[PDB]
Design a binder for these strands. Structure first.
Ligand SMILES: [K+]
Ligand SMILES: [K+]
Ligand SMILES: [K+]
Ligand SMILES: [K+]
Ligand SMILES: [K+]
Ligand SMILES: [K+]
Ligand SMILES: [K+]
Ligand SMILES: [Mg+2]
Ligand SMILES: [Mg+2]
Ligand SMILES: [Mg+2]
Ligand SMILES: [Mg+2]
Ligand SMILES: [Mg+2]
Ligand SMILES: [Mg+2]
Ligand SMILES: [Mg+2]
Ligand SMILES: [Mg+2]
Ligand SMILES: [Mg+2]
Ligand SMILES: [Mg+2]
Ligand SMILES: [Mg+2]
Ligand SMILES: [Mg+2]
Ligand SMILES: [Mg+2]
Ligand SMILES: [Mg+2]
Ligand SMILES: [Mg+2]
Ligand SMILES: [Mg+2]
Ligand SMILES: [Mg+2]
Ligand SMILES: [Mg+2]
Ligand SMILES: [Mg+2]
Ligand SMILES: [Mg+2]
Ligand SMILES: [Mg+2]
Ligand SMILES: [Mg+2]
Ligand SMILES: [Mg+2]
Ligand SMILES: [Mg+2]
Ligand SMILES: [Mg+2]
Ligand SMILES: [Mg+2]
Ligand SMILES: [Mg+2]
Ligand SMILES: [Mg+2]
Ligand SMILES: [Mg+2]
Ligand SMILES: [Mg+2]
Ligand SMILES: [Mg+2]
Ligand SMILES: [Mg+2]
Ligand SMILES: [Mg+2]
Ligand SMILES: [Mg+2]
Ligand SMILES: [Mg+2]
Ligand SMILES: [Mg+2]
Ligand SMILES: [Mg+2]
Ligand SMILES: [Mg+2]
Ligand SMILES: [Mg+2]
Ligand SMILES: [Mg+2]
Ligand SMILES: [Mg+2]
Ligand SMILES: [Mg+2]
Ligand SMILES: [Mg+2]
Ligand SMILES: [Mg+2]
Ligand SMILES: [Mg+2]
Ligand SMILES: [Mg+2]
Ligand SMILES: [Mg+2]
Ligand SMILES: [Mg+2]
Ligand SMILES: [Mg+2]
Ligand SMILES: [Mg+2]
Ligand SMILES: [Mg+2]
Ligand SMILES: [Mg+2]
Ligand SMILES: [Mg+2]
Ligand SMILES: [Mg+2]
Ligand SMILES: [Mg+2]
Ligand SMILES: [Mg+2]
Ligand SMILES: [Mg+2]
Ligand SMILES: [Mg+2]
Ligand SMILES: [Mg+2]
Ligand SMILES: [Mg+2]
Ligand SMILES: [Zn+2]
Lengths: 124, 150, 208, 138, 83, 104
RNA sequence: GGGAUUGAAAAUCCC
RNA sequence: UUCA
RNA sequence: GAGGAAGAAGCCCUUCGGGGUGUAAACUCCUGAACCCGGGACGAAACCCCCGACGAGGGGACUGACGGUACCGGGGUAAUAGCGCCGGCCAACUCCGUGCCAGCAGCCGCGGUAAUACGGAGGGCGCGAGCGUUACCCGGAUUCACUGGGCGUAAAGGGCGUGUAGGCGGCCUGGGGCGUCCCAUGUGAAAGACCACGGCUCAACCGUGGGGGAGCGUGGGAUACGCUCAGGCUAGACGG
RNA sequence: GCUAGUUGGUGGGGUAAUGGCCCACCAAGGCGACGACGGGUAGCCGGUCUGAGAGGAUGGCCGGCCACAGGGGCACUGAG
C-alpha cells in the first residue's frame, strides 16, 4: 500500500488465540470427574484412549486425557488439569496430571517416572 | 589443493509403468580457502556417481572471491529465483554467521568473518546459486577505480 | 560438583586423548592407547557421517571436558568473552587458562586438573600471599601463585614439585621451584597453547 | 504529468544503460544538472551537455560502460550498476550529517541535497551538513 | 525544613551511605535535592569519606539542617573549621 | 516562554472571542512522510478587533474561561477566506457520512 | 470370546 | 469396504 | 584426589571365538566438607560532659539486634545424585515383552509378531542440586513487510463512471524561512544499562569515577530540496 | 453524530489563586472523520524482557508521579 495509505490506515497487529482456555492462563487447573470413559481415535489409528469429562474451577466442562498404562479415576475423582492436546482425539486439549489428587501415579513405571508421577523405587 | 563439501543429496523419483524409477541429485562446493570456490550440481542413477559428477561440475564452475582479510569488500543482496541472500562484511572475531548452505560456500571461498541472511524461498539449490552469484558480483575499490576511471 | 566419574571414557568419546588423569594418560594406559574408539556397547561400529551440529557439539565437549568445567560455568565465560573486546575465540581461551585451579596445574603443583582443583579447595594454595580456595578464582597477570606455607611439607607437594625440578614450563608462566611459587606473567595467546580444539566451532555451537 | 522529474531522470539513465545507449536525453532543469555534475565528476557518466531538442532544452547524458567480456554474452559491465531514488514526493527523506549513509562501504555514493548545495555523502560529511537524501548510486 | 542526611545504598551487611540534601519528609532512600558526599562506615577502602565541603557550606548557608551523624562526618572534613 | 501560535480565524460568532485554526507539519513517527495535523484554539479578543480570514499570532495566557487559554497577540495579514473556506468545506462534508448520503 | 478367510482388519461363514 |  | 587387569563378580549382548558396563569397583597411598576445641569481629562516634566562648578546636564517657555469627588458629572423618532424552528435526542402539492391543506423540507420525518410535533392561547422549512439565512474553515470523511483502492463474483490482475532501505537482527568478540542515546552550532525578577501577578469599551482590545520544526549550546561522507569497514561461492540460 | 452550564459575554459568589468552579442576567454558540459521542480494557513513568536493528511485549521488586482506605456523600480543624 502507498505510504499515505499506511499513514491513513496503518498496519494491524497480529493477535494470538489461546489453545488452552483453562482461564487465567493458569499453568494448571483443578476439577472433578463427571464421566470417565474410553474414546476411539481417528484415522489411521485404533484403540481405546482413556478420557474424562472434567468440571473445572475455572467454570469450564472440558474433556481431559488420562495418560499412562492404567488409572484409578471414577465419577467423583478430584484431579489437576495440565493442558496438552492429544492429536488423535479431536476435542481433547488437556491432560490430567498423574500423581496429584485422586489420580494415582503409574506403579511399576521405571523410566519417564517424573511424568506419570511415580516415586523412585528403592533398589536392593 | 581443492576441498569439497557436500551441500545436499536428494533422491528424486520419476514414473514409469511398473513403478517409480529413481535418480539422485548432489550439490557440491569446492574451494581452496584462498578466494576460489565452485558450485556443482550433479545428477545420476547412484549417489556416488552423482556426488562425483557434482564435484566434477563444480571445478568447471569457479569464482574469484575478493577476500579482504577474511571478509567481503562490501554488502550485497542477490535474488535467484524466489530465494534472496544477504551478505554483509564483518570484523574479525565475528565468524561466519550463515545457514549451512551459504556457510559451506563462504568457508571454502576462504571467508572467515561475514554476516549473512537467507530471505524468501530457502530452497538449498536456489539459495546456493544466489550465493555464488552474490560472490561473483563483488567488486573492489581497485575495480570500481578502473571502471569509473575511464 | 564437577563431573566426578569415569574419565578415560570421555577421551574415548572425543576420539582424542584428554589429560583427565595426568601421569597415567602418559604411560600406555590412557585407554586411548590400545582402545581409542568411543565407549559403550556400540563403540567399535562404523560412525555415521556426523551432522554439522554433531561436530560443533563434540568439539565444545572436548574443549570443556578438558578444563573440567560445568556447562553453566563454561557458558558464562564464553558470554563474558563474547562481550569483551578482541577476538572472542582467543579471549575465551585466555579466560579459561586464568582459572586458579588450572594455573595450579599448569605450574605443576598438581598432576591433573581434578587434583589441581582439590589442592585449591583445601587451601593448599596461595595467591599473592593469602589463601584462596575458589578453583574458579581468576588469576590476573602479576599474581604469585605459591603453595600453602604450611603445605610445602606435604608428601604430595614434594613429588610433583620435585619432578618439576628441571622442566621448562608455559612461556606466559614462570615456576620458581624453590619457594614453590609461580608467576602468572601474561594471558596466553592462542599461539602459546596447543589445545586439540578448534575454538571456531565452539563459537559456532553457541552461534546457533 | 511527471510526478518525480528526478526519478524520471534516474530512470532514463537506468533504462538507457541497460540497452547500452550512446547518450540519452532528459528534459533539462537546474537541479537535474546539479545531479549530473556529480555523476560526471564521480565518473559514472562520460559527461553531459545541454541541448535543444525540438526547441525545448534537454540534457544529453553520455553514458559509459566497461569493456567487452568473454565467454557467452560479451556485454560489458555497467559503470552504473545501481541507481535508485531514496527521497520521493509523499515521503521525503532527510538526514543529519550524523545520519548520512555509507553506500557500499564507499565503493558507492549517495547524493544529498543540502542548504550548501548538492553533494555526495563525503562532500556533505566534509562540510558537516545533512539534507534530503536524494538517491544512491553504485 | 530541608536536611543533610545519610541515604542508604550498598547491600545487606554492606552499608554504603550517601551524604544527601533532601526535604525532611522524603523516604530515607527517596529522591533527594543533591548529593554532597558519600560515606562508608566500614572504611573498606582508603577513600571512605568524601564531602563537597563547598557545596556543604552552601546548603547550611540556606538552611539545610544536618543529622547528628551527618554533622559528625561534615566536620571530619572540616566543613566547619574556621581557623 | 509563553507559547505563540499562528492561525486563521474561522469564527467571530462569539462575544469577545475568536476561534483560531492552527496547522502543524511534522514527519510521521513511523512512516516518515511529512503529515499535517491541526487544532482549533479559542482566543481572547477584548475589543472585537479581529475577524474572519485574519491570520493572527496567538499567545499562551492566564485562563479567561473554561476552554479559553489564549489571547490574540497580533494581526499577520488581513482577509483571506481561501483558508476559512477550506475549513468550512471540510465540515460541510460531515453533513453526509452517517445514515444518509449527500451530493459531492 | 474361537476357528475359517486376511498382511491384519471390517464383511462373510462355521461353533 | 479400512489401514499398509 | 593419584595409582590401580589385556580387564573380578553380576548384568547386557553374541556369528558364542568374543564384545560392553570398565580403571569403573575392590584395594594401596594422599588431602580432609562435616564435626570437636580455642580466639573472636567491622558495622560506633556522635548526641551528652569538661576545657575553650553553649563557636572553631581536643579531651572524655555510654552504646551491637544481627552474634559467640563472620573471619582466624588447632584437631579432624572419604563423606548425597539425581532428572530428561536416544525415528527425523535433534547429541545418543541393541535384546526381550507386546501384536491397530496396551500405549506414544511438539510437528511429521509410530503399534495390526521378528517396533532403533509403545513397556522393561543393558548400553548411550545432555544437564547436574537439579532435571523435566504446563502457562505466558519476544525471537525465528520480511507470517501486518517503516527498515522489509504482496494482488493475471496461489489470498487479493472496487462492475463502470463522475467527482467532494484529502494525497501528489512542469520550466525560470525573487522575497520569507514553516519542513529540512548546522553551531551553541538549558533541560534530560537517582537507580538500572555500558566502560574503567575498586570492597566482601571469587562471583552473585555492592561502591566510586567516566561517557551518554535522542526528545523537547532557547539563541544564532544556511536556503539546495519541500512549503508559502510575487512575477514570468510554454513542453502538461484545456480551448480555436 | 455529540452538547445546553452546553460555548462565550457582563456582574457577582468562592478560593492562596486563574476559571461556567458556582450563581443571576444576555448572547447562540462549542465539538467531530486529523475520529467528537459511545462501548471495551487499563493506574502512567524511570525501566524490564526480547530483537541485528526498526520494532514487539511489559510495568513484580527498587525510585518518581497519581488514585484509593467496606460503598456513597460532606464539611470541620489546620501552613497543609
Ligand atoms: K533477478
Ligand atoms: K580448620
Ligand atoms: K471481483
Ligand atoms: K528564496
Ligand atoms: K464570570
Ligand atoms: K505501556
Ligand atoms: K515502554
Ligand atoms: Mg508498518
Ligand atoms: Mg490451562
Ligand atoms: Mg480422519
Ligand atoms: Mg495406526
Ligand atoms: Mg503442548
Ligand atoms: Mg538419500
Ligand atoms: Mg573479482
Ligand atoms: Mg520475488
Ligand atoms: Mg515462505
Ligand atoms: Mg569478543
Ligand atoms: Mg527511478
Ligand atoms: Mg538501479
Ligand atoms: Mg528508507
Ligand atoms: Mg464577535
Ligand atoms: Mg470569564
Ligand atoms: Mg495582548
Ligand atoms: Mg451535523
Ligand atoms: Mg461398503
Ligand atoms: Mg489403521
Ligand atoms: Mg579413582
Ligand atoms: Mg589424615
Ligand atoms: Mg570505630
Ligand atoms: Mg562495633
Ligand atoms: Mg564555659
Ligand atoms: Mg563550656
Ligand atoms: Mg542514644
Ligand atoms: Mg542423531
Ligand atoms: Mg517417551
Ligand atoms: Mg519385537
Ligand atoms: Mg527402542
Ligand atoms: Mg523418539
Ligand atoms: Mg523402545
Ligand atoms: Mg549451582
Ligand atoms: Mg512467536
Ligand atoms: Mg515481524
Ligand atoms: Mg500470522
Ligand atoms: Mg513496505
Ligand atoms: Mg506474501
Ligand atoms: Mg481457483
Ligand atoms: Mg486469486
Ligand atoms: Mg483467485
Ligand atoms: Mg476491473
Ligand atoms: Mg460495469
Ligand atoms: Mg514544484
Ligand atoms: Mg540536548
Ligand atoms: Mg543524561
Ligand atoms: Mg539518569
Ligand atoms: Mg575483587
Ligand atoms: Mg554510576
Ligand atoms: Mg506562477
Ligand atoms: Mg461547567
Ligand atoms: Mg485535529
Ligand atoms: Mg483496573
Ligand atoms: Mg529479526
Ligand atoms: Mg524482525
Ligand atoms: Mg515502585
Ligand atoms: Mg472512594
Ligand atoms: Mg470512602
Ligand atoms: Mg499545624
Ligand atoms: Mg481553615
Ligand atoms: Zn585419559
Amino acid at each position: 500500500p502507498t505510504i499515505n495509505q499506511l499513514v491513513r490506515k496503518g498496519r494491524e497487529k497480529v493477535r494470538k488465540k489461546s489453545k488452552v482456555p483453562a482461564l487465567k492462563g493458569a499453568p494448571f487447573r483443578r476439577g472433578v470427574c463427571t464421566v470417565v470413559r474410553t474414546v476411539t481415535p481417528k484415522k489411521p489409528n485404533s484403540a481405546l484412549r482413556k478420557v474424562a469429562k472434567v468440571r473445572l474451577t475455572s467454570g469450564y466442562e472440558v474433556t481431559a486425557y488420562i495418560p499412562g498404562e492404567g488409572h484409578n479415576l471414577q465419577e467423583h475423582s478430584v484431579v489437576l488439569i495440565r493442558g496438552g492436546r492429544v492429536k488423535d482425539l479431536p476435542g481433547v486439549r488437556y491432560h490430567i496430571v498423574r500423581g496429584v489428587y485422586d489420580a494415582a501415579g503409574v506403579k511399576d513405571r521405571k523410566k519417564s517416572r517424573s511424568k506419570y508421577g511415580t516415586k523412585k523405587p528403592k533398589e536392593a | 589443493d581443492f576441498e569439497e563439501k557436500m551441500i545436499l543429496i536428494r533422491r528424486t523419483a520419476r514414473m514409469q509403468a511398473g513403478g517409480r524409477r529413481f535418480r539422485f541429485g548432489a550439490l557440491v562446493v569446492v574451494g581452496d580457502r584462498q578466494g576460489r570456490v565452485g558450485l556443482g550440481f550433479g545428477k545420476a542413477p547412484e549417489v556416488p556417481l552423482a556426488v562425483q559428477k557434482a564435484g566434477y561440475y563444480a571445478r568447471r564452475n569457479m569464482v574469484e572471491v575478493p577476500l579482504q582479510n577474511g571478509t567481503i569488500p562490501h554488502e550485497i543482496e542477490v535474488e535467484f529465483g524466489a530465494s534472496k541472500i544477504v551478505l554483509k562484511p564483518a570484523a574479525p572475531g565475528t565468524g561466519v554467521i550463515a545457514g549451512a548452505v551459504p556457510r559451506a560456500i563462504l568457508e571454502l571461498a576462504g571467508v572467515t568473518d561475514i554476516l549473512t541472511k537467507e530471505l524468501g524461498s530457502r530452497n538449498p539449490i536456489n539459495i546456493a546459486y544466489a550465493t555464488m552469484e552474490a560472490l561473483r558480483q563483488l567488486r573492489t575499490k581497485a575495480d570500481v577505480e578502473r571502471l569509473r576511471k575511464g | 560438583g564437577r563431573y566426578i566419574g569415569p574419565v578415560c571414557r570421555l577421551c574415548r568419546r572425543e576420539g582424542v586423548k584428554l589429560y583427565l588423569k595426568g601421569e597415567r594418560c602418559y604411560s600406555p594406559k590412557c585407554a586411548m592407547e590400545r582402545r581409542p574408539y568411543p565407549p559403550g556397547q556400540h563403540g567399535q561400529k562404523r560412525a555415521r557421517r556426523p551432522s554439522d551440529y554433531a561436530v560443533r557439539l563434540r568439539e565444545k565437549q572436548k574443549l570443556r571436558r578438558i578444563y573440567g568445567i560445568s556447562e553453566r560455568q563454561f557458558r558464562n565465560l564464553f558470554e563474558e568473552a563474547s562481550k569483551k573486546k578482541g577476538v572472542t575465540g582467543s579471549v575465551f581461551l585466555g579466560l579459561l587458562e586464568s582459572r586458579l585451579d588450572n594455573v595450579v596445574y599448569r605450574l605443576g603443583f598438581a598432576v591433573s586438573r581434578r587434583q589441581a582443583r582439590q589442592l585449591v579447595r583445601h587451601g593448599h594454595i596461595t595467591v599473592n600471599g593469602r589463601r584462596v580456595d575458589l578453583p574458579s578464582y581468576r588469576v590476573r597477570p602479576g599474581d604469585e601463585i605459591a603453595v600453602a606455607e604450611k603445605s610445602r611439607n606435604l608428601e604430595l607437594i614434594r613429588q610433583n614439585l620435585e619432578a618439576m625440578k628441571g622442566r621448562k614450563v608455559g612461556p606466559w608462566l614462570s615456576l620458581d621451584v624453590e619457594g614453590m611459587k609461580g608467576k602468572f606473567l601474561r594471558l596466553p595467546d592462542r599461539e602459546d597453547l596447543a589445545l586439540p580444539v578448534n575454538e571456531q566451532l565452539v563459537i559456532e555451537f553457541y552461534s546457533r | 504529468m511527471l510526478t518525480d522529474p528526478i526519478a524520471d531522470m534516474l530512470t532514463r539513465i537506468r533504462n538507457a544503460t541497460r540497452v547500452y545507449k550512446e547518450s540519452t536525453d532528459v528534459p533539462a532543469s537546474r537541479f537535474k544538472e546539479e545531479i549530473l555534475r556529480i555523476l560526471a565528476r564521480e565518473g559514472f557518466i562520460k559527461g553531459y551537455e545541454r541541448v535543444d531538442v525540438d526547441g525545448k532544452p534537454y540534457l544529453r547524458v553520455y553514458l559509459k560502460y566497461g569493456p567487452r567480456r568473454q565467454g557467452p554474452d560479451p556485454r560489458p559491465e555497467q559503470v552504473i550498476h545501481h541507481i535508485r531514488r531514496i527521497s520521493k514526493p509523499g515521503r521525503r527523506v532527510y538526514v543529519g550529517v550524523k545520519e548520512i549513509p555509507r553506500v557500499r562501504r564507499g565503493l558507492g555514493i549517495a547524493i544529498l541535497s543540502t542548504s550548501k548545495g548538492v553533494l555526495t555523502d563525503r562532500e556533505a560529511r566534509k562540510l558537516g551538513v545533512g539534507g534530503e537524501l536524494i538517491c544512491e548510486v553504485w | 525544613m530541608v536536611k543533610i542526611r545519610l541515604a542508604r545504598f550498598g547491600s545487606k551487611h554492606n552499608p554504603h551511605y550517601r551524604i544527601v540534601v533532601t526535604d525532611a519528609r522524603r523516604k530515607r532512600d527517596g529522591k533527594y535535592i543533591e548529593k554532597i558526599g558519600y560515606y562508608d562506615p566500614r572504611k573498606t577502602t582508603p577513600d571512605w569519606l568524601k564531602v563537597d565541603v563547598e557545596r556543604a557550606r552552601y546548603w547550611l548557608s540556606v538552611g539545610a539542617q544536618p543529622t547528628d551523624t551527618a554533622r559528625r562526618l561534615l566536620r571530619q572534613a572540616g566543613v566547619f573549621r574556621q581557623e | 516562554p509563553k507559547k505563540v501560535l499562528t492561525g486563521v480565524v474561522v469564527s467571530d460568532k462569539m462575544q469577545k472571542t475568536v476561534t483560531v485554526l492552527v496547522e502543524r507539519q511534522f514527519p510521521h513517527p513511523l512512516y516518515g512522510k511529512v503529515i499535517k495535523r491541526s487544532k482549533k484554539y479559542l482566543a481572547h479578543d477584548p475589543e472585537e478587533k479581529y475577524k474572519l480570514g485574519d491570520v493572527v499570532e496567538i499567545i499562551e495566557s492566564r485562563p479567561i474561561s473554561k476552554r479559553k487559554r489564549f489571547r490574540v497577540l497580533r494581526l499577520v495579514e488581513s482577509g483571506r477566506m481561501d483558508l476559512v473556506e477550506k475549513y468550512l468545506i471540510r465540515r460541510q462534508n460531515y453533513q453526509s457520512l452517517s445514515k444518509r448520503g449527500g451530493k459531492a
